[PDB]
Design a protein around this ligand. Structure first.
Ligand SMILES: Cc1cc2nc3c(=O)[nH]c(=O)nc-3n(C[C@H](O)[C@H](O)[C@H](O)COP(=O)(O)OP(=O)(O)OC[C@H]3O[C@@H](n4cnc5c(N)ncnc54)[C@H](O)[C@@H]3O)c2cc1C
Ligand SMILES: Cc1cc2nc3c(=O)[nH]c(=O)nc-3n(C[C@H](O)[C@H](O)[C@H](O)COP(=O)(O)OP(=O)(O)OC[C@H]3O[C@@H](n4cnc5c(N)ncnc54)[C@H](O)[C@@H]3O)c2cc1C
Ligand SMILES: *SCCNC(=O)CCNC(=O)[C@H](O)C(C)(C)COP(=O)(O)OP(=O)(O)OC[C@H]1O[C@@H](n2cnc3c(N)ncnc32)[C@H](O)[C@@H]1OP(=O)(O)O
Ligand SMILES: *SCCNC(=O)CCNC(=O)[C@H](O)C(C)(C)COP(=O)(O)OP(=O)(O)OC[C@H]1O[C@@H](n2cnc3c(N)ncnc32)[C@H](O)[C@@H]1OP(=O)(O)O
Lengths: 444, 444
């Protein structure tokens, strides 16, 4: 009857909705540190670029809707500072008044996500130095752009967010530099596929600095330069996007098990090792279909799936989480960048014997107008030929190909079985053999 | 050592290539009625519309390449009139001289495709009345357009070719009418999905006449009108696209088994019931993954797959054809029309107990600019919830969704398992739950 959920976004409220729909008697309390529930963090770079009208558009469901329509006791400005798992009590501090409130639970869900990491650099706190995670973060970036005169923007780190924001700043007419860490080389894309990204950045005059370490941010009250071990470069706005940390700090003192980075370990049913305590989303570990290990790939698709499953399992409607594939997709300038399953760094790390096939092809029939190049790479087990992963890069039809690859991986297909699938074809959409199938044929 | 292939296009030459690559000794003779090998019939409507420069662009590999590079004895203007399966002799007529040649075989492949059907209507042979199958057919259509004043075009029959050519004729600035057949209502799309097609045609001023029967084409030397049981309408060019017949006539008296429509029955290995005689592509039957029966769905993807498999199996490199899903995709004006697996008429026809889910959705996040409506319908088994088929209609992301559905059908997935797949998402490509997954969730 008493369900408590910590975190009022994707994982937390996906759970809440399951509970509310499948238990009419349920008393659901949700505890959110901020003032905004159920919003799309994914849309933030597109609000900042002006492509979306306002952050208001990103809100999927109101706290007022959660309260009035669904009868969920949704709290705002409630930061949980500790949980007593023996007494089954959650302790929340109001972020403004600092008053402490107790919430007893029969079942608890931790859905606190991750936070972006700001390393302890001199200049950390300078005006115009930004992280991007929340709606307030986006507004503050917009406020820097609106007041302060911004010509040069430096992005620290890459990955999805760094790349998307490099585009956003280019589209806002800025001169964009990216400074890239060595610790993230090959983590998403293999070297040969990443070449297409460097080429596209160069093409749009996004300066990318490799093997260069941030030393400090310089300026008065506002930032005006980035200092590295190799130089000092003008910057009127710095976005730091170098890594994330699970928001699980507050659970020190409980016996709740955590991986090395602090992500909460969950079994098939979203349960921690502590009785009646569940976790879901970016704050939790993610069973990997191919790795067969509990990984951490904090993404919004997985968070909704895990959150929905946490709610269901909290209701004893037993259903197992099938896993992540490490699927990810990025819009970067004119390119679409997609990956799923294992890349070479991942395969090597697991000591899985693998081979690769790469094809430079097109998204559709070469004779059809506006046919575009399509770069597609697959990994497969050298013994069983089990498909292990794929990377697709091009202007069009990249999402289609990665979803097909994802489906293949989910079903544990052999690479050559792809040849046998009746995939769709007409000249404006594909070639008579899909690029995936052409690559499959090249495999041993 | 002696391999003979009848038909010099997709199925026949996919086979020849397999044989040539996997047997160095092989003497391959290919017998082709026309003068053009290995061309994309699929691109024909796009040459006629002007989108593709010329028919030459559709040729994937020519007879000179087959002869000089691959050592295939590729014959043109050779029409096979007779096969003696006991003596293992193929009899061919030269189409010009009418001289008779004979070809001895160890293994034979029939890859003769289908032909468009011209019903026995008065006016059949009037100038401006056209079938569309071959490059010469397209040139003849272009010739009618170049030398005559065409303003009104009438198309007999819907289907993929009918709809594509309706587009082509609208794009050429013509007033287009199409007169649809009642026998083919619900064969591709369910009634509720077909509504979207009728709406889009109406929007572009394509007159569609329902339950109306053609009785004659009228005119002096050329067509000037089409007469039906309900009226007589002006037409300067008539395209008849009402069905196809397997080119298997010539095999009468061989004991080669054939279905009711004349398509050659093949087993898993592309073998007919007659020793050392194979068949593949449009002239052959197509084992259906979902129907679990030998169907006939003649398209170019299946033709290449079957032709490739026939060559391999002719070399005793034993490999089973996994089947068709009945996948099909059409560009129609602003819409993309995709279907795969079973529709309602097919499910009912088989007495497979089924339910449906239909979702009016978008191709991506609703808040993202240029997000477009997406209409998606799924069929699934009442008892096991096994996915049975899908129909998707919309402006963008239709091909992606049908290929995902195709993959699911190939793997015999239950509808709710789709909820678990780590499909890709970023705002420019999808919603955080794919439309297929949202439909899956509505299912019982
Ligand atoms: C710029 C950006 C772009 C992205 N793009 C994509 C994309 O294209 N595709 C994709 O799949 N994913 C994307 N993501 C990731 C996606 O936004 C997240 O994976 C998803 O929001 C995770 O949901 P969650 O509920 O686990 O965590 P969150 O959405 O982070 O929610 C956790 C909530 O818990 C609250 N909280 C934390 N600690 C406490 C506490 N102690 N007490 C009370 N409340 C607390 C926080 O205020 C927060 O609201 C993107 C993320 C960012 C930042
Ligand atoms: C307008 C149009 C659009 C199409 N669009 C698509 C599409 O978008 N997607 C798709 O998948 N498919 C499409 N198709 C279908 C695709 O073109 C065919 O399925 C494919 O060409 C079939 O290959 P095949 O080798 O079995 O037969 P064919 O390609 O028809 O080749 C058979 C050959 O056999 C020869 N032949 C016949 N009889 C004899 C004989 N007695 N002796 C010697 N030779 C003989 C013929 O001359 C012919 O060249 C389209 C077809 C048309 C007409
Ligand atoms: S950066 C991307 C990550 N961020 C976000 O997703 C944004 C924050 N999102 C959330 O917090 C959740 O995604 C919310 C908005 C809470 C989703 O809540 P719900 O789970 O209630 O989602 P829906 O409102 O879409 O409801 C889903 C269930 O309702 C059934 N259903 C929907 N529509 C219909 C119709 N028309 N007819 C019948 N049923 C319908 C669905 O089947 C679904 O049922 P389940 O039982 O939940 O599968
Ligand atoms: S309307 C659409 C239907 N119409 C048509 O398809 C047009 C007519 N088409 C055809 O007749 C055939 O599709 C043709 C053009 C004959 C294709 O013949 P091939 O089967 O020879 O096709 P490829 O030339 O692509 O060769 C395929 C085999 O070669 C291997 N391969 C290609 N490229 C490479 C590279 N770079 N490196 C290694 N191997 C390569 C493929 O793996 C493939 O091998 P298989 O053993 O056949 O799988």
């Amino acid at each position: 009857m008493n369900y408590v959920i910590i975190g009022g976004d994707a994982a937390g409220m996906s759970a809440a909705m399951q509970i509310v729909r499948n238990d009419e008697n349920a008393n659901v309390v949700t505890l959110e540190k901020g003032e905004i529930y159920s919003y799309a963090q994914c849309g933030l770079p597109y609000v900042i670029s002006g492509a979306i009208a306002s952050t208001e558009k990103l809100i999927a469901r109101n706290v007022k809707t959660f309260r009035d329509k669904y009868g969920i006791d949704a709290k705002v400005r409630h930061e949980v500072t500790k949980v007593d798992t023996e007494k089954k009590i959650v302790y929340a501090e109001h972020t403004k008044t600092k008053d402490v409130f107790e919430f007893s639970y029969d079942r608890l869900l931790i859905a606190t996500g991750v936070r972006p990491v700001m390393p302890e650099w001199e200049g950390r706190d300078l005006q115009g130095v930004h992280l991007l995670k929340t709606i307030p973060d986006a507004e503050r970036i917009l406020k820097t752009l609106e007041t302060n005169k911004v010509e040069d923007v430096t992005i620290i780190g890459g990955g999805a967010i760094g790349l998307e924001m490099a585009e956003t700043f280019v589209e806002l007419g800025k001169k964009v530099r990216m400074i890239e860490r060595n610790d993230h080389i090959g983590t998403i894309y293999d070297g040969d596929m990443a070449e297409y990204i460097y080429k596209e950045a160069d093409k749009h005059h996004i300066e990318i600095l490799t093997n260069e370490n941030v030393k400090a941010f310089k300026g008065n009250e506002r930032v005006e330069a980035v200092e590295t071990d190799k130089g000092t470069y003008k910057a009127d706005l710095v976005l730091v996007s170098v890594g994330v940390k699970p928001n699980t700090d507050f659970l020190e003192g409980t016996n709740i098990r955590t991986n090395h980075k602090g992500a909460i370990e969950v079994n098939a049913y979203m349960q921690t090792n502590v009785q009646d305590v569940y976790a879901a989303g970016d704050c939790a570990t993610h069973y990997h279909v191919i790795k067969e290990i509990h990984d951490h790939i904090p993404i919004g698709t997985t968070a909704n799936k895990q959150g929905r499953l946490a709610g269901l399992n909290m209701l004893d409607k037993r259903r197992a989480f099938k896993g992540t594939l490490g699927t990810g997709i990025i819009k970067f300038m004119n390119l679409t960048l997609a990956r799923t399953g294992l890349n070479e760094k991942e395969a090597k790390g697991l000591h899985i014997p693998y081979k690769t096939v790469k094809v430079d092809s097109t998204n559709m029939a070469g004779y059809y107008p506006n046919a575009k190049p399509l770069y597609l790479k697959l990994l497969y087990r050298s013994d069983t030929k089990q498909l292990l992963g794929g990377q697709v890069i091009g202007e069009e039809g990249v999402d289609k190909r990665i979803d097909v690859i994802a489906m293949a991986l989910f079903n544990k297909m052999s690479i050559h079985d792809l040849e046998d699938v009746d995939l769709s074809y007409a000249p404006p959409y594909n070639s008579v053999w899909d690029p995936i199938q052409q690559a499959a044929r090249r495999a041993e």
